[PDB]
Amino acid sequence: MDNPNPGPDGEGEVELEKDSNVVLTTQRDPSTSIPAPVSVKWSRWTSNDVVDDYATITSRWYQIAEFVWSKDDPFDKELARLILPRALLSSIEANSDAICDVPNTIPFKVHAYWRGDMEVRVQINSNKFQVGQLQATWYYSDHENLNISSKRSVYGFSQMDHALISASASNEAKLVIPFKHVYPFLPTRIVPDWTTGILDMGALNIRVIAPLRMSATGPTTCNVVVFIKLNNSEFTGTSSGKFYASQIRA
Amino acid sequence: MDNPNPGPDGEGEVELEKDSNVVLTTQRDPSTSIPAPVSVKWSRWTSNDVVDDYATITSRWYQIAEFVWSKDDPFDKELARLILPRALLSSIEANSDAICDVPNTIPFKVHAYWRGDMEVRVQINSNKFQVGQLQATWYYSDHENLNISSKRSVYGFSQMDHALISASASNEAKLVIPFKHVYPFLPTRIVPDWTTGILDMGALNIRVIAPLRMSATGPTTCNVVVFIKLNNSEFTGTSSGKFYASQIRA
Amino acid sequence: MDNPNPGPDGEGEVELEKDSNVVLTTQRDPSTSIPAPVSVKWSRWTSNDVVDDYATITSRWYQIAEFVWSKDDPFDKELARLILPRALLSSIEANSDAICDVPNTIPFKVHAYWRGDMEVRVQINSNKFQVGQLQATWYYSDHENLNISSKRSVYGFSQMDHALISASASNEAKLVIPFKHVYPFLPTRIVPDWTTGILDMGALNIRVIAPLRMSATGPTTCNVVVFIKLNNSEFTGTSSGKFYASQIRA
């Protein structure tokens, strides 16, 4: 079946992802990447306090990153290497804004410990005349590894669970990332231990496998949007906001 | 389903509209605009004489207009403001041709009064690299309104029944226009009343909502075809042709 | 149905033709051309000796020709006029290679007489911005006709069984050519008769019906691939290879 019928509305389907007071669309189905099974709820294990999450409020879609994709970028050059708990907060905090100001962060302010699966969209608007390729990959503990520069390479992450994005026919990388840390919970700020590496479950990272191969005088620049949903969460550990921690640098 | 298979014949469907000794096609389904219900037959009311229409002859598709669409045309600039009974005749008469010469007009020559629904095609051949938009709109009595210049605007006709045409993915505006005048019949020429505004049931009018937005050195010009079918008619009122009226100017 | 969904893999089906240790694909269904019924097996008629063919070995897909398609080529200019038994061997022999070296020829070396249907692919990689047209046509005995230059024309072969190839939406010409000679068998080399015209069942020939109509500075050159399958064969007539014949010139 192939009859093209673009009316006053150029025809084509648009799948949407609402899902909680925010609707974000994608005109092209994503290339998913599921690195692990869905995480069970270990609140009834580690902590016996206010055991809950926040539905309509922390299970939304906030923006955490956005960047540029150009012909200048050589073969393996990561556009982002963003930590995943974590840079949800660390993006907003360095936006000359506070964590307290946004609805998808506020319990991190009050509550001490967090556990939950993650959802991520790597949406880009590239043109059909751009011949490039990216790869969004996940690593459940990047900073803990010593020589991960060895792994920090397009070759290395192809070896593992990832998603693929090609400039033409742009395209989205779905990226379901459930919770798998060593300890079942994460600490939102400084704690009797975890005096650093606060709220870090691993980093995402997008490098390049094919530069934007542009014709003579073709459009140079491109762009990426990183979105994140925090579903299936649990926030036990009620603590005043003066105990909080404005996350570390990029 | 999306497998593209363009053989020696580039594949794609072509819907056709024959319908009476003329076949006109459209490779893209139209955006219809039905302003009113189908009109009932009031011949057995106003006049008791030869009560009939003409099938294969006046229910065809003649051309009445054609024009240019260019980047120069600013935002709201009507390409045509053509009266609808009316300019079926008024186009041919000013073509240095006579009404008598064409089969889709001849009963208007002889017969005194006419009633009937109308069918109209606003077909254009624009290219997929042209980013513009038109709007064909109908008004069951334009000349009767005094300040209709107020209405003569892209904003105003969007308020009402219309069709939309965008340059890219060109595209057709189906435009079924049934009979709705004040008096159930129309006079083909001067009459004991209707000494002017002869044969006028309202005017069609195509303005611009988006100019042809062309890249550097992209194709400048475009073009429109206006076709018209006169179905569901009735022509009671037999009169010699020396009583006829060559319609007024553009 | 027309929803376009080109993921990291630009979506679209790819039909394949394996068929015997070689897989060749075509992303666009072919325009077939069947000039005759399937040939019956006349081995149990002409010759009472080792009656067999060779499956996995001579029923493969070898390349016999490839050439250039450019704007310079005027209206009717044959890109190839290749004989069909025949140039399967005659291409390889003039490749500074021997017949003995390739698996799809070796029985022709040993065996004296051959009969069999033929399969041919005229695959080309033209771009969607090239507006040309070719025509691959078959003639069960071209050399036998005296004034076939009269027939050697785009007009003439359109009169008969052929396939059509247009530059844009490139495209393949399937070309099933069963055996129909005067005598039911063909001689692989010189023989008590057939002292010339060795192994010739007719010639294929691709001319032009529409040159590559290229925009300013659009891509000039193009290209064709000719493939051939020799199925439904029969090779009776065992003879030493010193009796063989390296085919005549192009």
Burial string for A167-198 (b: 16+ CB within 10 Å, else e) reads bbbbbbbbbbbbbebeebbbbbbebeebeeeb
Which residue among A1, A5, A10 places its CB closest to the CB of B168? Answer: A10
Output the CA–CA distances (angstroms, integers) from residue A48 to A45, A55, B96, C94, in the order listed: 8, 20, 95, 86
State which residue of chain C sits closest to A12, comparing Cα positions. C3
C-alpha closest to that of A40 among A118, A112, A116, A113: A116
Contacts of residue C217, Cβ cutoff 8 Å, sequence gap at least 6: none
State which residue of chain C sits closest to B10, comparing Cα positions. C169
Q: Do C1 and A4 touch (CB under 8 A)?
A: no
Map tokens 């003995």 to a residue: C100
Q: Do A5 and C6 touch (CB under 8 A)?
A: no
The letter for the amino acid at C73 is D
Q: How many residues does chain B have?
A: 250
C-alpha closest to that of C243 among C113, C103, C48: C113
Output the CA–CA distances (angstroms, integers) from residue C92 to A173, C114, C139, C229, in the order listed: 48, 19, 23, 15
Rounded to whole angstroms, how far apart are CA atoms A210 and A208? 6
Rounded to whole angstroms, how far apart are CA atoms C82 and C207? 11
Task: Answer for the pair B65, B196: CB distance below 8 angstroms, yes or no.
Answer: no
Substitution target from C1, C2, C29 for chain A, most A beta carbons within 10 A: C2
Rounded to whole angstroms, how far apart are CA atoms A219 and A102? 35
Instruction: Provide, as residue numbers in chain B, all residues whose Cβ is less than 8 Å from the Cβ of C2.
Output: 1-2
Rounded to whole angstroms, how far apart are CA atoms B198 and C242? 98
Cβ count near C96 (within 10 Å): 6
> What technique solved it?
X-ray
Write out the DSSP string of chain A: -------SS-----EE---TT---EESS-------SPPPP--HHHH--S-----HHHHSS-EEEEEE---TTS-SS--SB--BTTTHHHHHHHTTT--GGGSTTTHHHHHBSEEB--BEEEEEE---TT---EEEEEEETTSTT-SS-TTT-SHHHHHTSSEEEEESTT--EEE--B----SSSSEESS--SS--SSTT-S-EEEEEEEE-----TT------EEEEEE--S-B---B--GGG-------
Strand order, beta sheet including B133-139: B162-166, B133-139, B203-210
Task: Answer for the pair B27, C2: CB distance below 8 angstroms, yes or no.
Answer: no
**Which own/partner pairs from A241-247 qualify as long-range (CB within 8 Å, at least 24 positions apart)?**
A241/A100, A241/A109, A241/A110, A243/A112, A243/A189, A243/A190, A244/A99, A244/A109, A244/A188, A244/A189, A245/A188, A245/A189, A245/A190, A245/A198, A246/A93, A246/A99, A247/A86, A247/A87, A247/A89, A247/A90, A247/A93, A247/A198, A247/A199
Rounded to whole angstroms, how far apart are CA atoms C69 and C212? 8
Map tokens 């039905």 to a residue: B34
Burial of A95 (0-12, 13-18, 19+ CB in 10 A): exposed
The letter for the amino acid at C221 is T
Instruction: Provide, as residue numbers in chain C, all residues whose Cβ is less than 8 Å from the Cβ of B6.
Output: 28, 168-169, 171
Instruction: Provide, as residue numbers in chain B, all residues whose Cβ is less than 8 Å from the Cβ of A1.
Output: 1-3
Phi, psi at A155, each rounded to 5°: -60, -50
DSSP state of C156: H
Q: Do B6 and C31 touch (CB under 8 A)?
A: no
State which residue of chain C sits closest to B7, comparing Cα positions. C171
Q: Could you give the 3-state DSSP secondary structure of residue B238?
A: strand
Phi, psi at C206, each rounded to 5°: -105, 110
Rounded to whole angstroms, how far apart are CA atoms A227 and A60? 10
Rounded to whole angstroms, how far apart are CA atoms C45 and C51? 11
Contacts of residue B72, Cβ cutoff 8 Å, sequence gap at least 6: none
The letter for the amino acid at A169 is A
Q: Do C171 and B10 touch (CB under 8 A)?
A: no
Map tokens 């090239």 to a residue: C130
Instruction: Provide, as residue numbers in chain C, all residues whose Cβ is less than 8 Å from the Cβ of A2.
Output: 1-2
Instruction: Provide, as residue numbers in chain A, all residues whose Cβ is less than 8 Å from the Cβ of C2.
Output: 1-5, 11-12
Which residue among A1, A2, A7 places its CB closest to the CB of B28? Answer: A7
Instruction: Provide, as residue numbers in chain C, all residues whose Cβ is less than 8 Å from the Cβ of A171.
Output: 6-8
Which residue among B1, B29, B163 places its CB closest to the CB of A5? Answer: B29
C-alpha closest to that of A60 among A13, A14, A121, A113: A121
Give the pair of three-digit tokens for residue C215: 């925009």
Output the CA–CA distances (angstroms, integers) from residue A32 to A40, B129, C168, in the order listed: 21, 33, 34
Task: Answer for the pair B204, B73: CB distance below 8 angstroms, yes or no.
Answer: no
Which residue among C3, C4, C29 places its CB closest to the CB of B7? Answer: C29
Rounded to whole angstroms, how far apart are CA atoms C11 and A236? 46
The answer, yes or no, to whether the previous bond of C142 is cis (omega within 30 of 0) is no
Give the pair of three-digit tokens for residue C188: 């692989």
Output the CA–CA distances (angstroms, integers) from residue A222 to A133, A206, C50, in the order listed: 12, 14, 68
C-alpha closest to that of B169 among B26, B68, B69: B26
Task: Answer for the pair C122, C31: CB distance below 8 angstroms, yes or no.
Answer: no
- Kindly provide the residue ranges of all beta strands, DSSP E only, lying in chain B, ordered along the sequence: 15-16, 25-26, 62-67, 113-114, 119-124, 133-139, 162-166, 172-174, 186-187, 203-210, 224-229
Rounded to whole angstroms, how far apart are CA atoms B52 and B238? 11
Phi, psi at A15, each rounded to 5°: -75, 140
Rounded to whole angstroms, how far apart are CA atoms B9 and A23? 41
Task: Answer for the pair B140, B181: CB distance below 8 angstroms, yes or no.
Answer: yes
**What is the gyration radius of the CA atoms in chain C, in angstroms?**
19
Rounded to whole angstroms, how far apart are CA atoms B142 and B148? 7
Phi, psi at C234, each rounded to 5°: -170, 125
DSSP state of B58: H
Rounded to whole angstroms, how far apart are CA atoms B197 and B215? 44
Query: Terminal CA-to-CA distance of chain B, rounded, Å?
Result: 49
**What is the gyration radius of the CA atoms in chain A, in angstroms?**
19
Task: Answer for the pair A216, A177: CB distance below 8 angstroms, yes or no.
Answer: no
Angle, CA of A178, A180 and A182, to the nearest 5°: 165
Q: Do B169 and A1 touch (CB under 8 A)?
A: no
The minimum CA-CA distance between C8 and chain A, rounded to whole Å, is 5
Instruction: Provide, as residue numbers in chain B, all residues whose Cβ is less than 8 Å from the Cβ of A8.
Output: 31, 133, 163-166, 171
Instruction: Provide, as residue numbers in chain C, all residues whose Cβ is less than 8 Å from the Cβ of A165.
Output: 8
**Cα C117 off chain centre by:** 11
Rounded to whole angstroms, how far apart are CA atoms A122 and A65? 10
C-alpha closest to that of A12 among B31, B13, B4, C3: C3
**What is the gyration radius of the CA atoms in chain B, in angstroms?**
19
Rounded to whole angstroms, how far apart are CA atoms B197 and B187? 9
Phi, psi at B93, each rounded to 5°: -65, -30
Query: Which 8-47 residues of chain A touch chain C by CB within 8 A?
Result: 11-13, 28-31
Instruction: Provide, as residue numbers in chain A, all residues whose Cβ is less than 8 Å from the Cβ of C4.
Output: 12
What was the resolution (in A) of this experimentally determined structure?
3.8
Rounded to whole angstroms, how far apart are CA atoms C235 and B73? 74
Map tokens 């390409």 to a residue: B79
B2 touches chain C (CB under 8 A): yes
Which residue among A12, A13, A171 places its CB closest to the CB of C8? Answer: A171
Contacts of residue B216, Cβ cutoff 8 Å, sequence gap at least 6: none
The answer, yes or no, to whether the previous bond of B86 is cis (omega within 30 of 0) is yes
Instruction: Count chain B–chain C contacts defined by CB atoms under 8 A.
Output: 38
B164 touches chain A (CB under 8 A): yes
The minimum CA-CA distance between A219 and chain B, rounded to whole Å, is 13
